[PDB]
Amino acid sequence: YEHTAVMPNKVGIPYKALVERPGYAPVHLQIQLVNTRIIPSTNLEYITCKYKTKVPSPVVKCCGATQCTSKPHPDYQCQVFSGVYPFMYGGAYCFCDTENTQMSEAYVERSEECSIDHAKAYKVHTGTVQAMVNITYGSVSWRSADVYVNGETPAKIGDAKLIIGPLSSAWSPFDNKVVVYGHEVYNYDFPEYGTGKAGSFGDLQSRTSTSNDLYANTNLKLQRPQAGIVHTPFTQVPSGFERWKKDKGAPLNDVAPFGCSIALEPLRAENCAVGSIPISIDIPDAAFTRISETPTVSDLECKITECTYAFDFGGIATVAYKSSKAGNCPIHSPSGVAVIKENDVTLAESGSFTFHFSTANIHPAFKLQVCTSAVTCKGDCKPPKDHIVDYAAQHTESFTSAISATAWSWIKVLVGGTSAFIVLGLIATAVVALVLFFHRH
Amino acid sequence: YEHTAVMPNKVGIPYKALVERPGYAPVHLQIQLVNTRIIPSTNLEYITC
Ligand SMILES: *[C@@H]1O[C@H](CO)[C@@H](O)[C@H](O)[C@H]1NC(C)=O
Within 8 A of B22 by CB-CB distance, chain A residues are: 306, 308, 310, 314, 382, 384-385
Whether A108 and A52 have beta carbons less than 8 Å apart is answered as yes
Angle at A182 between CA A179 and CA A183, to 5 degrees: 90
* Deposited resolution, Å: 3.9
Strand ranges inside A93-190, DSSP E: 101-110, 118-125, 129-137, 140-148, 155-157, 160-164, 177-181, 184-186
Q: Which of A19, A197, A35, A51 is nearest to A117 (CA)?
A: A51
Q: Which of A363, A317, A355 is nearest to A337 (CA)?
A: A363
Angle at A367 between CA A365 and CA A372, to 5 degrees: 165
- Neighbouring CB atoms inside 10 A of A365's CB total 13
- Neighbouring CB atoms inside 10 A of A366's CB total 22
User: Backbone phi, then psi, for A185, in 5-degree steps?
Assistant: -120, 135
Question: Is the CB of A146 inside a 6 Å radius of any atom of ligand 1?
Answer: no
**Alpha carbons A361 and A358: distance in angstroms, whole number:** 9
Whether A198 and A219 have beta carbons less than 8 Å apart is answered as yes
The residues near A323 (Cβ < 8 Å, ≥ 6 apart) are: A295, A296, A297, A298, A329, A347, A348, A349, A350
Within 8 A of A384 by CB-CB distance, chain B residues are: 22
Question: Is the CB of A142 inside a 6 Å radius of any atom of ligand 1?
Answer: yes
CA of B14, closest CA in chain A: separation in Å?
27
Strand ranges inside A70-117, DSSP E: 77-82, 87-88, 91-92, 101-110
The ligand 1 atom nearest the CA atom of A144: 13
Whether A356 and A305 have beta carbons less than 8 Å apart is answered as no
User: Backbone phi, then psi, for A140, in 5-degree steps?
Assistant: -80, 130
Whether B30 and B14 have beta carbons less than 8 Å apart is answered as yes
Distances (CA, A) of B49 to A434, B24, B42, B44, B46: 110, 66, 20, 14, 10
Distances (CA, A) of A362 to A310, A378, A381, A385: 11, 11, 5, 15
User: Backbone phi, then psi, for B17, in 5-degree steps?
Assistant: -160, 160
Residue A21 per-residue DSSP state: -
**Separation of CA A140 and ligand 1 centre (Å):** 13
Angle at A158 between CA A152 and CA A160, to 5 degrees: 45
**C-alpha A275: how far from its chain's center?**
11
**Alpha carbons A102 and A62: distance in angstroms, whole number:** 8
The 3-state DSSP composition of chain A as helix, strand, coil percent (nearest 5) reads 15, 40, 45
Radius of gyration of chain A (CA): 38
Distances (CA, A) of B24 to A89, A249, A314, A364, B27: 91, 48, 10, 20, 9
Q: Which residue of chain B has the CA closest to A384?
A: B22
CA of B43, closest CA in chain A: separation in Å?
48
Say if the Cβ atoms of B22 and A385 lie within 8 Å. yes
CA of A314, closest CA in chain B: separation in Å?
6
Whether A221 and A236 have beta carbons less than 8 Å apart is answered as yes
**Separation of CA A368 and ligand 1 centre (Å):** 26
